Amino acid sequence: HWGYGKHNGPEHWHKDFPIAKGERQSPVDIDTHTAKYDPSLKPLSVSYDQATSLRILNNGHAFNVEFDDSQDKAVLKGGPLDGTYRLIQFHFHWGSLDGQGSEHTVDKKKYAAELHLVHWNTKYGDFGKAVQQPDGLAVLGIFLKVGSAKPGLQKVVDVLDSIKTKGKSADFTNFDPRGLLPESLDYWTYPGSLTTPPLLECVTWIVLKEPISVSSEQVLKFRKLNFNGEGEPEELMVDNWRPAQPLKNRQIKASFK
Numbered sequence: 049h050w051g052y053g054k055h056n057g058p059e060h061w062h063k064d065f066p067i068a069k070g071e072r073q074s075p076v077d078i079d080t081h082t083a084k085y086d087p088s089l090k091p092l093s094v095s096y097d098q099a100t101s102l103r104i105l106n107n108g109h110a111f112n113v114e115f116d117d118s119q120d121k122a123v124l125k126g127g128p129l130d131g132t133y134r135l136i137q138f139h140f141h142w143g144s145l146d147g148q149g150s151e152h153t154v155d156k157k158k159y160a161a162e163l164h165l166v167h168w169n170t171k172y173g174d175f176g177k178a179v180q181q182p183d184g185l186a187v188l189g190i191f192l193k194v195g196s197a198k199p200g201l202q203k204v205v206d207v208l209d210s211i212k213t214k215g216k217s218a219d220f221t222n223f224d225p226r227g228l229l230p231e232s233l234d235y236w237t238y239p240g241s242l243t244t245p246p247l248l249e250c251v252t253w254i255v256l257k258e259p260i261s262v263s264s265e266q267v268l269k270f271r272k273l274n275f276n277g278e279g280e281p282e283e284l285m286v287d288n289w290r291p292a293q294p295l296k297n298r299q300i301k302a303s304f305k
């Protein structure tokens with residue numbers, strides 16, 4: 049149903065998901081001069097050493113690398129967060145051209161892609177309950193710029209041939225998501241939403257200041273994926289990003305000055 053085309057894209061989503069016009073929608077433009085440094089924000093705690101990746105799935109909108117979230121194996125804590133959030137999956141949003149693709153923007157600048165490491169608050173028991181709560185999710189967002197290759201990403205790139213079309217999945221064990229992080233964990237944070245339907249307003253967004261660099265060949269391989277299923281007309285999976293939404297009554301906070 050919904051997607052990213054002329055006839056089903058972000059400007060249409062509000063007709064089935066009226067919260068698309070809500071008070072805390074994501075993504076947003078991060079105006080760096082307007083964000084407020086909050087010296088009481090704690091450093092992020094990323095504990096991924098016990099992460100257990102399971103599978104990679106083309107869901108028709110992006111690809112998801114899924115993790116075992118039945119125990120506290122890969123968790124995000126600290127920063128603006130209270131409690132413990134478990135990593136359930138990561139995915140990306142990217143463009144058809146290197147000058148677009150990210151969901152968040154920084155002083156209106158678009159990056160080539162954006163990584164979302166999705167975590168849910170363990171006090172709610174399961175991801176489906178968590179998305180119903182204003183503090184249910186924490187998504188760690190990391191920008192990708194085109195330049196040198198990111199070695200930690202290559203294993204992802206290399207399996208994409210096996211999940212070209214919607215509904216395909218492949219075993220994807222022993223992937224270490226720590227290899228996708230930049231050096232610095234300086235971040236901006238604001239309350240927001242899922243950036244795809246159902247657009248639920250359940251996300252504490254934590255967007256890293258420092259982008260990672262990926263090579264032109266790496267992002268080109270993202271762009272060879274397909275939104276369609278096998279045996280349907282080929283539509284390249286590109287430009288699967290929602291544009292920046294109004295900030296409304298929200299202040300973006302920075303962990304760094």
Ligand SMILES: NS(=O)(=O)c1ccc2o/c(=N/O)[nH]c2c1
Pocket residue numbers: 049050051055056057060061062063064065
């Ligand atoms: N984007 S949305 O509100 O879920 C949307 C927009 C246009 C649509 O056309 C449809 N017939 O296949 N479904 C649909 C959903």
Ligand SMILES: NS(=O)(=O)c1ccc2o/c(=N\O)[nH]c2c1
Pocket residue numbers: 164166187241242243244245246251
């Ligand atoms: N793109 S996003 O805001 O990180 C995100 C994260 C988890 C999600 O689950 C979804 N369907 O149940 N959509 C979705 C978007």
Ligand SMILES: [Zn+2]
Pocket residue numbers: 139140141164243
């Ligand atoms: Zn996302």
